[PDB]
Amino acid sequence: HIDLSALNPELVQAVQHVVIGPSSLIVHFNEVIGRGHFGCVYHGTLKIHCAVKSLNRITDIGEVSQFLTEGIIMKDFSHPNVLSLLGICLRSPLVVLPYMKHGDLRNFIRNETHNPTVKDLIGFGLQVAKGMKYLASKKFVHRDLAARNCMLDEKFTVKVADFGLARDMYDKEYYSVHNKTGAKLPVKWMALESLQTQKFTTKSDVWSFGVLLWELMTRGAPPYPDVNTFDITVYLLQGRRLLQPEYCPDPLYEVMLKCWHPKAEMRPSFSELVSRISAIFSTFIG
Numbered sequence: 001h002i003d004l005s006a007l008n009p010e011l012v013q014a015v016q017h018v019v020i021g022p023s024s025l026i027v028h029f030n031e032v033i034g035r036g037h038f039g040c041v042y043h044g045t046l047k048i049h050c051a052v053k054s055l056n057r058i059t060d061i062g063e064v065s066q067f068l069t070e071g072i073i074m075k076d077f078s079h080p081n082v083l084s085l086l087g088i089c090l091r092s093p094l095v096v097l098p099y100m101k102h103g104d105l106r107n108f109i110r111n112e113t114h115n116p117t118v119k120d121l122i123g124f125g126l127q128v129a130k131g132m133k134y135l136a137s138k139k140f141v142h143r144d145l146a147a148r149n150c151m152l153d154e155k156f157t158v159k160v161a162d163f164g165l166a167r168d169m170y171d172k173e174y175y176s177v178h179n180k181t182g183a184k185l186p187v188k189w190m191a192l193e194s195l196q197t198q199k200f201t202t203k204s205d206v207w208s209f210g211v212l213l214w215e216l217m218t219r220g221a222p223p224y225p226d227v228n229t230f231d232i233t234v235y236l237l238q239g240r241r242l243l244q245p246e247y248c249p250d251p252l253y254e255v256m257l258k259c260w261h262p263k264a265e266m267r268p269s270f271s272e273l274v275s276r277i278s279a280i281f282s283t284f285i286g
């Protein structure tokens with residue numbers, strides 16, 4: 001039930017634009033197209049093709065008013081490199097997202113079917129940087145930027161995803177349980193200070209982006225395979241970084257090193273990353 005009175009009065013008008021009427025959505029529950037900890041995702045028809053995420057695997061949703069607020073905030077986000085929210089359908093509520101034909105970025109670059117060039121791979125990086133530039137300008141911290149968490153549409157447009165109501169753990173292997181807090185953390189993508197404090201910032205998103213660039217240039221290799229979970233802090237503090245992939249241009253590796261600056265405030269902004277990477281991208285043919 002929608003309690004319009006419970007919402008921030010500023011946001012009441014926006015409800016009509018986020019709520020999908022049950023008769024407008026057909027969801028094809030017979031084939032799962034994605035699996036998250038909080039729920040499965042299915043093909044949907046809205047006639048536009050969409051992805052429908054269930055949240056029924058969680059014991060409880062929480063405050064319905066908060067859920068709508070989350071949806072309303074997320075729907076106002078509009079950028080070609082950021083996954084949009086189509087709306088919410090109240091059957092546990094269903095999250096309705098544009099269908100991303102080529103799935104997550106990590107699986108796409110690991111796929112022997114497609115053959116992206118070095119230029120294509122850098123371009124995927126550039127698109128992610130533009131999405132993050134948008135998100136950072138909205139003061140939004142992603143917290144879980146990784147190749148597994150970005151997706152590609154039918155025209156290979158890369159979109160930063162896995163945020164707002166779409167937030168989940170879509171690949172359980174890369175999340176470790178913290179001793180004191182219990183939080184499940186993507187430790188191999190996290191900035192040194194975040195591992196120490198569990199505080200996430202746009203500058204820790206920049207660190208994660210550096211790892212994402214490394215993923216692209218290795219075509220989806222796992223980072224730090226010979227490191228075990230939380231021993232990553234010890235490993236990094238020894239004076240170590242991910243090595244330069246064979247086909248990674250030198251200036252792109254320099255960008256990665258800047259993203260992993262020990263001082264958070266010294267890391268490049270996403271705007272600077274867009275500029276620097278667009279330059280490097282332009283030097284390639286094909």
Ligand SMILES: COc1cnc2c(NCc3nnc4ccc(-c5cc(C)ns5)nn34)ccnc2c1
Pocket residue numbers: 033034035041051053083097098099100101102103104107148149150151161162163166167170171
């Ligand atoms: C082509 O198959 C799919 C699968 N899942 C989604 C999908 N799932 C919800 C979602 N929102 N953000 C993210 C980010 C990552 C992922 C996934 C990652 C993995 C490994 N499987 S799904 N899903 N996801 C949304 C849109 N299109 C899809 C297309």
